[PDB]
């Protein structure tokens, strides 16, 4: 955005100088008629009229011109019109802590026209994430993800019908791709858990839902909480190693379920008071184990439902 | 693209003097002929006549002038008229998972003509790619390829030709060059499963 102003005064100073010159010949016709109380008369004419004119002529001239300019301009480059400052905050609902968090986000504008994909640089990065915080701590401010480049020297770009796009729609969705982050392990020597910046999580996580059953609930106040348990793989000579996994064990180990008179209970509520709901595959394989206890109500029978690796098991409040 | 107006208020003064001087000689001819009852008569005549004049003027002037331009610029380089910005997504048909992926790709324009070659940057690395999986999962919006850099600091460019004959012809191919990728490996003594970083797919 320019603007400019301008003065001028100008001062303009003009001497001129005329001759002229001018034959003009002229023929004059005259005729008449005169008459009296006895006396008539007439009369004819010509006139020879030759003219000469000469003319000098000077002229002086000031001529102050004052001028006044404005001006104003806007400049604009339709690749890179505007650029993208996303305040934002990482969340660790799981149960272990990660270490140097680098979310690779993902900018996507209207349906699923992604902007940008940004793996978070130092700036970004998270020390700790313990579950169940916030990074910055909620009391703090978001932190800014301004930059593509590895060392957070260019700006998120953003071309111009994206522009145009974006404040007409206001349609700019945040996508998380995947994670980075270490595990910090236990050192028996000395005691001090440590950080390996060479292991991370993306190693550990696919061997963990690959061999656990999960089980989403959330009577806890309507927030939905996952928790994963060990689940015999039968196809796999090493997860039959571990030990059998009754879906009434998992939710009393898993999510603080307890028999204080003989029943399954949440707290103070009653385990019925909750409904299952499967993905199709776990909604087979229960299908199967009701079928071979010859039971129809599964609820008398949590104690006899055997988990398996890769079940799905939603728990919700039947309420709602 | 560039815009510009402009206001002009304009202010004029102008004084004028001006002198003249003429010298006019003229020459008069005259005949008549005269008739009555009884009576003619005739006359001739010559007209002797000279004239000197002397003329002064002045003059002042006002002028206003106001003047109001609009203006319009449209700049271009005929190197770098375009930017690439190719939405992608990752599968893995096989069986086993590949980490941190980062595929070469190679974009090409028309039959043949490569525009760019790209291997994966940091922003375009995916951690774990497992056997029939999709990063980003397919749910997820597709990642974003926009740099040539090491540092993912300049654009992909496409040049004025290319460029018209992508918004006449439309069409741009994704090859998939080659993959790299890290084996993650089953350690024996305490049972993780540890990514080599070393050691990759290229080889096996």
């Known amino acids: 955005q320019s603007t400019q102003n301008t003065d001028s005064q100008t001062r303009t100073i003009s001497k001129n100088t005329s001759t002229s010159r001018t034959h003009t010949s002229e023929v004059h016709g005259n005729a008449e008629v005169h008459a009296s109380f006895f006396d008539i008369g007439g009369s004819v004419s010509a006139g020879f009229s030759n003219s000469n004119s000469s003319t000098v002529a000077i002229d002086h001239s000031l001529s102050l ?77 978001p932190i800014a993800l301004n930059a593509q480049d590895d060392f957070s020297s260019t700006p998120i770009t953003m071309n111009y019908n994206q522009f145009l796009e974006l404040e007409k729609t206001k349609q700019l969705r945040l996508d998380t791709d995947q994670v980075y982050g270490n595990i910090a392990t236990y050192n028996f020597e000395n005691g001090r858990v440590r950080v390996d910046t060479g292991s991370n999580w993306s190693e550990v996580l696919p061997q963990i839902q690959e061999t656990t059953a999960r089980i989403i609930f959330n009577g806890k106040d309507l927030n939905l909480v996952e928790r994963r348990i060990a689940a015999v793989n039968p196809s796999d000579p090493l997860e039959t190693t571990k030990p059998d996994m009754t879906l009434k064990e998992a939710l009393k180990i898993a999510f603080g379920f307890n028999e204080p008179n003989g029943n399954l209970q949440y707290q103070g509520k009653d385990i019925t008071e909750f409904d299952f709901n499967f993905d199709q595959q776990t909604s087979q394989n229960i299908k199967n184990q009701l079928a071979e206890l010859n039971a129809t109500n599964i609820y008398t029978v949590l ?18």
Do not use: C, H
């Open 65 to 141: 011109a004052g001028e006044r300019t404005w001006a104003e301009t806007m400049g604009l480059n339709t690749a890179d019109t505007a650029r993208l400052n996303a305040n934002i905050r990482y969340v660790n609902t799981g149960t272990a802590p990660i270490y140097n968090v680098l979310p690779t986000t993902s900018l996507v504008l209207g349906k699923n026209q992604t902007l940008a994909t940004i793996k978070a640089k130092e700036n970004q990065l998270s020390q700790i994430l313990a579950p169940n915080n916030y990074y910055p701590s909620k009391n703090l401010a």
């Open 303 to 320: 104690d006899k439902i055997k988990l398996n690796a890769k079940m799905n098991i939603l728990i919700r409040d039947k309420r709602f």
